[PDB]
Amino acid sequence: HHHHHHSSSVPSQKTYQGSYGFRLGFLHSGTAKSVTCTYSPALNKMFCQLAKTCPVQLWVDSTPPPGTRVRAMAIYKQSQHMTEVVRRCPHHERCSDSDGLAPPQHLIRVEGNLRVEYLDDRNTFRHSVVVPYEPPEVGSDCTTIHYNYMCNSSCMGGMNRRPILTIITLEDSSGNLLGRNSFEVRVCACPGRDQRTEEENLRKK
Ligand SMILES: [Zn+2]
Secondary structure (H helix, E strand, O other): OOOOOOOOOOOOOEEOOHHHHEEHHHOOOOOOOOOOOOOOOOOOEEEEEOOOOOEEEEEOOOOOOOEEEEEEEEEEEEEEHHHHOOOOOHHHOOOOOOOOOOOOOOEEEOOOOOOOOEEEEOOOOEEEEEEEOOOOOOOOEEEEEEEOOOOOOOOOOOOOOOOOOEEEEEOOOOOOEEEEEEEEEEEEEOOOHHHHHHHHHHHOO
C-alpha cells in the first residue's frame, strides 16, 4: 500500500515496571565467533545476525490478567530520525522471505507462535508485532519470546546503517500500558566481535 515514511508520534522508550514488576531478561552475554545473538548488560544492547533467533525473557513479580499481550516495536535511536518509520529495505521487502504470517515490510518478526499478530498502525504508521503473554510453565521462572530481525546494518536502504532501539511493552487486552522496557539493537555479521569491542570502547569512554 501507499507507504508513509514518517509518523506524527514517537513512542516512549522509558522503562516502566508497573503493577506487575515487568522486566526483561537475556539468556547470555558471551561473545564467541559462533554467537548469533548476544546481549551486553553494560550497554543494554543486543548484537545479533540477520534473521537469526533472538530470545528475550519476560519477567513479572505477579501473574498479569488473562488477555495480556506483549508488543515489540523498533524506532531509530537518533532523535534526528526518530519520526521515521522503521521498515525493511527494498531488497528484503521484495525478496519473498515471508513465513506466511509476517508482512514483508516488517523488520521485527516472532517465530514459533501461531497467535502472532502484525500491525501496521493506520494512525501512527508504526509497525509492531504482538503475541499473547504466556505465564511461565509450572517450575519455570519466566517466559521467552523469540524475535527475528529481518535487515542488518549493511543493508542498502531501510535502516541504512542507522542504530535502532527495540521497545517491548506489556499491555492488557484493552491496549493499556502495563510495563515497558527497551534495548538498543545492532544487527551485524559478527555480533560477538562487535560487542566485545564496543564494551571495550565503553570501558575507555
Ligand atoms: Zn534489508
